[PDB]
């Protein structure tokens, strides 16, 4: 269900990284599969060539943590009005304290040593469930239908 | 613009927000509504310097850069006990344990 | 507005806005039945960071502005994870 539409209508977009993370732009092709694009260092902007109806999502380039674009999960370029590009403001979401804690413990402990931490069993499973573009797309297609 | 603070005295901490243009006196009115002590029985500090009631919080050094929601600035508090003010005493928080072997 | 007191295991009292403390579902339940909540396993170096998270969450949720990172020092990360899991 979630895929770019092959409109062939050009649309200029500014990918503006308003986050402290290195951003990985991800384009969902016409079969719904994610393709990685060049990364954006924190606080940088790039004027890029895209098309109307094309579906984009943005992640942390090192850990694949989910990021927002114009306060939502997916970005679709629209027609350029008055010779102006469309801004795609990539920002950090307000993560839950538990998710932010999992992000920091994952950045310090190797996955083979998660089981060595003196924590409850459910927290080992939470640490192992790393951010995954494939999983979040399934969750988004299910909520798009419903 | 808003400034986010921790008003600290002995073993009590108030997490509150205020405008950068608001005064030290207006911050004492906030403390009055929580700890039930009037502004004349209060002294607010930054590190060790006593703050004058008529200055703005920005004029004291509490700005969007030093007083953030996720990193609030500390404002020391000392109450008046029978016509004399107690010495400013802020008990520090507990020390974290040694960093685990797998995290090192 | 309304305030609540959250006491750490080492005796520190944290006075926070009731709306902010209601970020945690566990705290909401503790205030619904059996304005003070005592945490016998959360120390002050963890509970002070939990209170900083509540104001961070209330300030930046639904805001259309640049969101800063919520910082966590490596020394407190594991205990803060345990507290966040209990508090939801
Ligand atoms: C500098 C930079 N930094 C981060 S990302 C980036 C960037 C670089 C170059 C382009 C140029 N456009 C494309 O490569 C895509 C855009 C897509 O919307 C459609 N598409 C594509 C291709 C093959 C079949 C069908 N469509 C394309 O040509 C974009 C971003
Ligand atoms: Cl560019």
Q: Give a three-class secondary structure readout of chain A.
A: CCCCCCCCCEEEEEEEECCCCCEEEEEECCCCCEEECCCECCCCEEEEEEECCCEEEEEECCCCCEEEECCECCECCCCCCCCCCEEEEEECCCCCHHHHHHHHHHHHCCHHHHHHCCCCHHHHHHHHCCCCHHHHHHHHHHHHHC
Residue A137, C-beta contacts closer than 8 angstroms, at least 6 positions apart: A2, A28, A32, A34
All structural domains of chain C, each given as residue ranges with its CATH number in brackets, are 3-87 (3.30.710.10)
Measured in angstroms, the CA of A112 and the nearest CA of chain B are apart by 10
**What number of other Cβ atoms are within 10 A of residue A56's Cβ?**
22
**What number of other Cβ atoms are within 10 A of residue B73's Cβ?**
18
Distances C6 to A26, A131, B14, C27, C32 between C-alpha atoms, Å? 43, 33, 11, 9, 15
Start-to-end CA span in chain B (Å)? 39
Distances B10 to B66, B71, B92, C14 between C-alpha atoms, Å? 22, 20, 9, 12
Ligand 1 atom 6: residue of nearest CA: A38
A16 lines ligand 1 (CB under 6 A): no
In contact, A124 and A112? CB cutoff 8 Å: no
DSSP state of B65: T
Start-to-end CA span in chain A (Å)? 12
- Domain A97-141: state its class: mainly alpha
Start-to-end CA span in chain C (Å)? 24
Distances C16 to B34, B54, C26 between C-alpha atoms, Å? 10, 26, 15
Q: Length of chain B in residues, anyone? A: 104
Q: Which two tokens stand for residue A96?
A: 């839950």
Spatial CA neighbour of B89 closest among B76, B80, B100:
B76
Interface contact C72-A93, CB threshold 8 A: no
Distance A48 CA to ligand 1 centre (A): 7
A139 lines ligand 1 (CB under 6 A): no
Burial category of A79 from C-beta neighbours within 10 Å (exposed 0-12, middle 13-18, buried 19 and up): exposed
Residue in the structure block whose two tokens are 């806005």: C17
Ligand 1 atom closest to the CA of A4, numbered from 1: 18
Distance C70 CA to ligand 2 centre (A): 29
Residue in the structure block whose two tokens are 């009055």: B32
All structural domains of chain B, each given as residue ranges with its CATH number in brackets, are 2-103 (3.10.20.90)
Q: Which residues share a beta bridge with A72?
A: A69
Distance A93 CA to ligand 1 centre (A): 25
Sign of CA dihedral A16, A19, A21, A25: negative
Q: Which residues share a beta bridge with A51?
A: A10
Give residues whose Cβ lies within 5 Å of ion ligand 2. A 46-47
Sign of CA dihedral B36, B39, B45, B46: positive
The enclosing H or E element of B74 equals: strand B73-79
- Which value in Å is the resolution of this experimental model? 2.0
A37 lines ligand 1 (CB under 6 A): yes
Interface contact B15-C52, CB threshold 8 A: yes
Spatial CA neighbour of A61 closest among A26, A93, A97:
A26
Residue of B nearest to A112 (CA): B102
Pick the CATH number of A10-91 from 2.60.40.780, 1.10.10.1100, 3.30.70.2080, 3.20.20.70: 2.60.40.780
Distances A34 to A3, A57, A79, A145, C12 between C-alpha atoms, Å? 9, 9, 23, 20, 49
Q: Is B58 helix (H, G, I), strand (E, B) or coil?
A: helix
Distances C28 to C23, C48, C55 between C-alpha atoms, Å? 8, 18, 16
Breaks in chain B, named by the residue before each, with C–N above 2.5 Å?
Answer: none
Q: What is the 3-state secondary structure (H, E, C) of B26-40?
A: HHHHHHHHHHCCCHH
Helix pair C77-87, A97-108: axis angle to 10 deg: 150
Ligand 1 atom 12: residue of nearest CA: A49
Kindly list the domain boundaries of chain A, sorted by start residue.
10-91, 97-141
């Amino acid at each position: 269900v979630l895929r770019s539409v092959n409109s062939r209508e050009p649309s200029q977009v500014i990918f503006c990284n308003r986050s402290p993370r290195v951003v990985l732009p991800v384009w969902l092709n016409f079969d719904g599969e994610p393709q990685p694009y060049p990364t954006l260092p924190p606080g940088t902007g790039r004027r890029i060539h895209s098309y109307r109806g094309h579906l984009w999502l943005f992640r942390d380039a090192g850990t694949h943590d989910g990021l927002l674009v114009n306060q939502t999960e997916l970005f679709v370029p629209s027609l350029n009005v008055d010779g102006q590009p469309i801004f795609a403001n990539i920002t950090l979401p307000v993560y839950t304290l538990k998710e932010r804690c999992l992000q920091v413990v994952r950045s310090l402990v190797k996955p083979e040593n998660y089981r060595r931490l003196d924590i409850v069993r459910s927290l080992y499973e939470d640490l192992e469930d790393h951010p995954n573009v494939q999983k979040d797309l399934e969750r988004l297609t299910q909520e798009r239908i419903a | 613009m808003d400034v986010f603070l921790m008003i600290r005295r002995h073993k009590t901490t108030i997490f509150t927000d205020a405008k950068e243009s608001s005064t030290v006196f207006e911050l004492k009115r906030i403390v009055e509504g929580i700890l039930k002590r009037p502004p004349d029985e209060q002294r607010l500090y930054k590190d060790d310097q006593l703050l004058d009631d008529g200055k703005t919080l920005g004029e004291c050094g509490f700005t969007s850069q030093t007083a953030r929601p996720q990193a609030p600035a500390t404002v020391g508090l000392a109450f008046r006990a029978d016509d004399t003010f107690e010495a400013l005493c802020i008990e520090p928080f507990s020390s974290p344990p040694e960093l685990p072997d797998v995290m090192k | 507005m309304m305030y609540v007191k959250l006491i750490s295991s080492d005796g520190h009292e944290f006075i926070v806005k009731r709306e902010h403390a209601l970020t945690s579902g566990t705290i909401k339940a503790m205030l619904s039945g059996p304005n003070e909540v005592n945490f016998r396993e959360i120390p002050s170096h963890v509970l002070s960071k939990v209170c900083m998270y509540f104001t961070y969450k209330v300030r930046y949720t639904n805001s259309s502005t640049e969101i800063p990172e919520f910082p966590i020092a490596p020394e407190i990360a594991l205990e803060l994870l345990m507290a966040a899991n209990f508090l939801d």
